């Protein structure tokens, strides 16, 4: 049974609610982004209308085989009518194709559903600027002040500089980057660009990347591993055993691996600056955990909410425990008292 925080009152609509069977009263299922916790339940046998971005619709058709007649892609930043209700899709600054959804209810209420997002001051100049929002359905993944991490640009600067230094010292070093979903493509693309290489990967991953409308992608990635000095592997393989095993397969072309695990936040963030990050090493293998986030920091979240000034907040993450819920409600009230709304 579908939980309340996935239902949009006053409409026939649900958000990210595909794992509950046929939801009573739902005439249109929105999908914010192509991450498995959110698409859970979708398949080629789905026969209701799914509304989403173009990129998400490429992935539904090619990876999950949803039939084309049920996929309804909408352009961003454009007022659209769906089943009698005005909606807008906004870039969520999450993974490729991820959106926030603005719903303009028939009774005059305006609802923003962030999906998963990384708040940014650039959102203060989208179509959000033009009117009041009554209810905010908020990605609260990192809603606690201990959650600090650097900008995505500082993280990429560290990775490029690290990779270019290592391979220039040793031209026989291979770079490996872990992945288990879409998002964080800038990590492996920026490293391959500095090294003058394409990124090598499995056929299944190449297919996924080909759905993402990235400019000049055919110039950047390949399935020919032998021709590439930046390889992508499943995240589960980014450990000393998996990397040893991979180095064997490269036929003595390489004698060292430098690997990257983009994580979200890890508690090494409470003490250490990005500049000061060091790897775990065993022999000729080094592994860096880098804090590349596609969710808001606590401070970025707070800034967005204090600018938006919603009348009510409904969290969509960390909702399963009473301690979590009570923590989040306390920060919402601080924020509102501090800013005066
Ligand atoms: Ni996500």
UniProtKB/Swiss-Prot annotation:
Distribution of this protein across tissues and organs: Expressed in brain, heart, kidney, liver, pancreas, placenta and skeletal muscle.
On induction, the UniProt comment says: During mitosis. The mRNA encoding this protein contains an internal ribosome entry site (IRES) in its 5'-UTR. This 5'-UTR generally suppresses translation while specifically promoting expression during mitosis, when cap-dependent translation may be impaired.
Compartments it resides in: Nucleus
The annotated consequence of residue 295 to A reads: Impaired nuclear focus formation, reduced interaction with PIAS and increased sensitivity to cisplatin
Subunit-structure text: Binds constitutively to TP53BP1. Binds CDC27, which is itself a component of the anaphase promoting complex (APC). Binds PIAS1.
User: Which family does the similarity line name?
Assistant: Belongs to the DNA repair metallo-beta-lactamase (DRMBL) family.
Per the entry, what this protein does is: May be required for DNA interstrand cross-link repair. Also required for checkpoint mediated cell cycle arrest in early prophase in response to mitotic spindle poisons. Possesses beta-lactamase activity, catalyzing the hydrolysis of penicillin G and nitrocefin. Exhibits no activity towards other beta-lactam antibiotic classes including cephalosporins (cefotaxime) and carbapenems (imipenem).
What's the protein name?
Answer: DNA cross-link repair 1A protein
What organism does the record attribute this protein to? Homo sapiens (Human)
Gene behind the chain? DCLRE1A
Q: Give from-to of the shown chain within the full protein.
A: 700 to 1040 of 1040
């Amino acid at each position: 049974t579908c939980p309340f925080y996935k239902k949009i009152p006053g409409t026939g609509f649900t958000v990210d609610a595909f794992q509950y069977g046929v939801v009573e009263g739902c005439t249109a299922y929105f999908l914010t982004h192509f991450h498995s916790d959110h698409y859970a339940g979708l398949s080629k046998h789905f026969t209701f209308p799914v509304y989403c971005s173009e990129i998400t619709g490429n992935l539904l058709k090619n990876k999950l085989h949803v039939q084309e007649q049920y996929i309804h892609p909408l352009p961003l930043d454009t007022e659209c009518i769906v089943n009698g209700v005005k909606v807008v899709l906004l870039d969520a600054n999450h993974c490729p194709g991820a959106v926030m959804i603005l719903f303009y209810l028939p009774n005059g209420t305006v609802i923003l559903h962030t999906g998963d997002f990384r708040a940014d001051p650039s959102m203060e100049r989208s179509l959000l600027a033009d009117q009041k929002v009554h209810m905010l359905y908020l990605d609260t993944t990192y809603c606690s002040p201990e959650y600090t991490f650097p900008s995505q640009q500082e993280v990429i600067r560290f990775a490029i500089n690290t990779a270019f230094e290592a391979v220039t010292l040793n031209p026989h070093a291979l770079v490996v980057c872990g992945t288990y979903s879409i998002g964080k493509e800038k990590v492996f693309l920026a490293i391959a660009d500095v090294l003058g290489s394409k990124v090598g990967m499995s056929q299944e991953k190449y297919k996924t990347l080909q759905c993402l409308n990235i400019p000049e992608i055919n110039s950047l990635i390949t399935t020919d591993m032998c021709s590439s000095l930046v390889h992508l592997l499943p995240m589960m393989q980014i450990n000393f055993k998996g990397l040893q095993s991979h180095l064997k397969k490269c036929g003595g072309k390489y004698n060292q691996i430098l690997a990257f695990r983009p994580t979200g936040w890890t508690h090494s963030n409470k003490f250490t600056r990005i500049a000061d990050v060091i790897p775990q090493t065993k022999g000729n293998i080094s592994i860096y955990g880098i804090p590349y986030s596609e969710h808001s920091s606590y401070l970025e979240m707070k800034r967005f909410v204090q600018w938006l000034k919603p009348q009510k907040i409904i969290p969509t993450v960390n909702v399963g425990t009473w301690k979590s819920r009570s923590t989040m409600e306390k920060y919402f009230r601080e924020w509102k008292l501090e800013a005066g709304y």
